[PDB]
């Protein structure tokens with residue numbers, strides 16, 4: 001419609017796949033699919049797995065008792081293989097007791113028939129296997145940290161202002177939790193339908209972008225909010241963005257990828273956000289945020305994304321660097 | 332007469348081994364081995380471990396009951412140490428009830444013989460220890476991602492074509508799941524028999540290859556299918572290749588390694604693929620795939636690996652660069 | 664031979680620490696300690712933890728039964744609180760049944776004395792917590808990936824030889840299992856004594872060394888046994904080595920670190936090795952180890968660390984640059 005976003009502001013992407021030759025890999029990764037599922041759906045499969053297993057073996061216990069004929073009334077002329085089985089519902093309760101390992105012991109397993117002994121072995125092994133598998137799935141779900149990515153907070157929209165003479169595309173990212181993100185990393189990409197002289201056409205060319213770090217690396221130590229900018233050098237594809245060329249249907253998008261292993265669970269998480277063409281404010285520096293109180297600092301997240309207007313030329317970066325060079329040479 | 336591949340098209344590293352002076356690498360690390368196995372083998376060992384423990388302690392319970400003298404039909408002052416034991420079947424079922432902790436209670440342990448108490452303690456500790464170990468293997472087997480690694484897709488044959496002036500070696504990677512692979516990192520290698528002037532003989536010299544990314548680094552953000560093109564500079568070992576020297580029996584291979592951690596299980600993975608000489612379609616470009624739907628993008632995977640020919644100067648990268656410099660000098 | 668290596672050929676950093684203010688942080692972190700310990704030590708602590716809990720609550724159950732008096736040899740006149748408690752052994756077996764959750768049911772808990780219900784709650788919670796903790800520690804001890812790191816193989820004695828004219832220090836590294844090591848990473852640090860002009864005397868100075876990789880990175884894909892070689896440039900602290908200076912009584916050592924997560928367990932590992940001066944063979948090359956089977960490639964691990972001899976200039980690499988410049992000038 002108006003303009004498709006590659007990744008939504010909340011971090012979820014919007015790309016739609018089509019014409020996939022389903023090889024069953026979606027079904028093949030049973031354990032991975034369970035982890036992805038929501039907790040209500042996980043609990044439904046959890047309940048259905050146990051209930052189906054309990055009911056399946058309950059029918060088997062009823063079947064073996066019916067075949068042995070020990071459920072019909074008897075007077076001392078018989079010894080049932082599973083004691084006190086005089087109804088199907090008794091077999092159902094017996095199945096619960098075995099697999100859950102409750103073992104009330106009112107419905108025992110006698111030494112008489114060997115088939116019930118084999119079925120008891122099978123039910124115990126199957127119960128342990130399913131318990132172990134559900135543990136694994138629950139342990140991977142309780143170790144999920146995608147809900148940690150939500151606590152990572154970016155500015156509502158980014159700016160482009162002059163700093164140290166040159167021009168840079170600024171940005172702010174914040175963390176709300178008290179915990180730390182070990183080995184953090186901020187990638188940054190521009191997504192443009194970039195045409196090439198040789199004749200190629202790319203529907204969405206993803207150009208990587210440096211983080212303008214001190215040592216030219218991707219490492220970032222994120223405790224307070226930081227003005228994470230990108231120096232618009234000659235090679236930067238943002239070198240030719242006219243401020244007059246900032247309107248809606250300008251084919252632009254600034255991906256941001258904040259990575260880093262969460263300290264608590266030890267799981268790595270991504271944070272994503274895309275700045276559109278009309279979501280950029282030219283020449284507006286960010287409001288200072290990190291105040292100081294008595295013996296301690298103070299971050300004012302109320303002013304997290306407020307930007308004040310600062311004067312700057314309304315010229316493309318090419319029209320700025322070239323002009324400055326000519327003036328210096330003439331002088 | 333059999334052209335050997337260093338890795339198969341689905342990873343599957345096809346390199347054998349010989350003369351291994353093993354010191355029990357199978358042994359003293361059995362936990363990694365159990366993770367390696369399939370589920371049929373895991374189930375068999377799962378059942379075998381429990382059945383061996385159950386049957387072993389069952390014999391012990393039977394033996395101690397017979398030692399106390401309770402199997403024989405004596406109703407006078409027998410006071411059996413393990414109640415209601417009257418065969419091996421009762422002993423085996425009792426061993427089930429202890430180690431599995433079912434505890435039916437029709438076969439109890441009384442205070443008579445303290446040796447039964449010691450055996451009960453041993454079986455409980457062994458049963459808990461084995462349950463703990465088997466749980467751990469299950470956790471490490473449910474957090475596997477080889478079944479996810481198979482979802483990553485690389486085109487059947489990569490192309491060489493001009494892009495932005497120079498010559499590059501394109502490719503196409505793809506993901507087939509809604510989940511993301513955090514911190515992807517594509518390392519590319521050229522495998523060849525390259526011998527140094529000094530006489531060194533290296534049969535498979537794995538030379539690394541830059542990804543020609545915009546920031547030098549390798550980390551690539553993979554949602555849509557992407558072109559992974561290596562720009563053939565004057566240093567790249569591809570700088571001396573022409574489509575005339577690109578028949579089948581030509582010693583080349585382009586290993587591609589797609590690293591990255593799955594966001595769900597938090598386990599790092601790898602996807603691998605190779606490209607022989609014949610499987611590098613010279614002078615062709617990939618078809619654009621990302622269309623636009625009513626309100627979002629449309630990756631038409633049916634056109635994932637189709638290429639359309641576009642003519643290019645059929646010369647080596649060294650000849651191309653030399654000819655361009657000579658033509659520019661003549662013009663200037 | 665008082666030579667003191669920095670690390671052994673199989674890791675095991677041979678450095679003794681002394682005068683440590685051990686303020687309990689070793690003992691405060693119990694779970695990490697329990698992971699480090701061997702299996703015989705773990706089993707002893709495993710058994711002792713459970714047995715201490717069993718005996719402790721056995722005393723508690725026996726004590727409350729005595730206090731209620733329901734263990735008196737007289738049978739009737741009342742109804743007991745915890746049934747079938749006759750001797751201490753009954754109380755201990757009852758403790759087993761509760762904490763292990765076997766629950767035979769011949770020794771139940773009735774409504775008589777409320778303190779039994781409270782003690783039952785305490786024992787159940789404590790038993791579950793101890794079981795949960797031991798499960799976690801066992802799980803961490805099953806994802807140990809140092810035994811796998813013991814199957815990473817480094818050649819016993821590494822070499823220095825001329826390749827592409829320049830002079831480089833080589834090394835052979837290999838894997839034995841069928842499982843890859845994802846995101847491998849080779850670091851190489853020289854341990855030497857540094858006496859800077861400003862008077863600094865660093866006893867064990869570690870200068871990192873570039874691996875001379877085709878992309879300038881420090882990552883390599885290892886399936887077949889690789890050849891790792893550092894190209895000795897004008898900035899490498901090996902730029903002034905000579906075959907004379909390469910005997911036993913030398914302050915040289917080349918620590919090599921092979922990192923990377925193992926694919927199965929998902930655990931990051933290291934493989935540490937060192938090459939003393941006398942453990943180097945100047946001017947010798949590695950035998951081609953990768954053969955070709957009729958159908959696929961081959962690896963001849965019998966000729967792993969075999970180094971043939973080859974002619975080589977017996978002079979420092981610095982002099983090679985000076986001679987090279989003089990040759991061009993001539």
Ligand SMILES: CCCCCCCCCCCCCCCCCC(=O)OC[C@H](COP(=O)(O)OC[C@H](N)C(=O)O)OC(=O)CCCCCCCCCCCCCCCCC
Nearest residue numbers: 035036037038039040041042043044046047141144146147
């Ligand atoms: C296994 C139950 C058997 C029947 C017994 C019923 C009695 C239930 C009480 C005891 C339940 C045990 C409590 C355990 C506490 C665990 C907490 C937990 O797992 O997270 C609480 C959950 C999480 O929701 P979420 O954040 O939206 O999910 C993750 C996210 N959406 C994602 O995609 O990662 O938040 C919830 O979800 C609420 C949890 C309450 C559980 C109630 C389960 C019944 C669900 C019925 C749903 C029917 C309709 C489903 C439609 C879903 C459409 C999407």
Ligand SMILES: CCCCCCCCCCCCCCCCCC(=O)OC[C@H](COP(=O)(O)OC[C@H](N)C(=O)O)OC(=O)CCCCCCCCCCCCCCCCC
Nearest residue numbers: 028029030122125126129130369370371374378477478481
């Ligand atoms: C008394 C106890 C009896 C048994 C009780 C069973 C109780 C069941 C309880 C619940 C079961 C839970 C099932 C788990 C669901 C997920 C399973 C799953 O994802 O994998 C399915 C597994 C096996 O796949 P894989 O080997 O890992 O696949 C290869 C590779 N990883 C890939 O996927 O890409 O496949 C399975 O889940 C099972 C498949 C069984 C197949 C048995 C085959 C016989 C074994 C020997 C075969 C080879 C023989 C020789 C052949 C030579 C050929 C040259």
Ligand SMILES: CCCCCCCCCCCCCCCCCC(=O)OC[C@H](COP(=O)(O)OC[C@H](N)C(=O)O)OC(=O)CCCCCCCCCCCCCCCCC
Nearest residue numbers: 359360361453456457460461699700701702703710804807
């Ligand atoms: C009161 C109730 C008692 C109950 C007793 C039975 C308990 C049964 C438990 C069943 C499960 C056992 C789990 C073992 C499975 C894996 C074993 C394995 O892979 O390693 C086998 C181990 C040897 O490894 P390590 O170097 O000590 O530790 C591993 C590594 N270094 C790590 O960090 O993980 O070595 C072993 O685990 C094997 C030990 C065999 C013991 C045989 C007895 C005679 C030899 C005794 C050996 C020396 C003992 C010295 C004691 C000194 C104490 C200070």
Ligand SMILES: Nc1ncnc2c1ncn2[C@@H]1O[C@H](COP(=O)(O)OP(=O)(O)OP(=O)(O)O)[C@@H](O)[C@H]1O
Nearest residue numbers: 350351352353816817818819820964965967968969
């Ligand atoms: N075929 C092989 N399989 C597995 N590991 C091997 C093999 N050959 C050597 N190794 C490993 O390589 C190392 C020893 O390498 P190297 O062959 O140079 O020494 P060596 O056999 O001890 O020497 P030598 O016996 O000639 O004194 C050890 O870690 C050893 O386990």
Ligand SMILES: Nc1ncnc2c1ncn2[C@@H]1O[C@H](COP(=O)(O)OP(=O)(O)OP(=O)(O)O)[C@@H](O)[C@H]1O
Nearest residue numbers: 019020021022484485486487488632633635636637
């Ligand atoms: N629509 C698709 N959905 C899923 N996987 C696809 C799809 N198209 C191609 N692939 C995968 O891409 C690889 C080859 O792509 P390409 O289309 O270039 O060749 P192909 O003729 O489909 O290959 P093959 O004969 O191996 O199936 C294979 O791993 C294949 O499974």
Ligand SMILES: Nc1ncnc2c1ncn2[C@@H]1O[C@H](COP(=O)(O)OP(=O)(O)OP(=O)(O)O)[C@@H](O)[C@H]1O
Nearest residue numbers: 678679680681682683684685686687688689690691
């Ligand atoms: N032997 C030691 N063992 C453990 N930690 C130590 C040791 N010596 C110093 N530290 C650590 O060094 C840090 C600085 O401690 P502090 O400056 O008070 O002592 P110091 O450096 O040993 O003093 P001094 O100058 O008297 O030798 C603290 O974090 C302390 O724990």
Ligand SMILES: [K+]
Nearest residue numbers: 102432433765
């Ligand atoms: K029980």
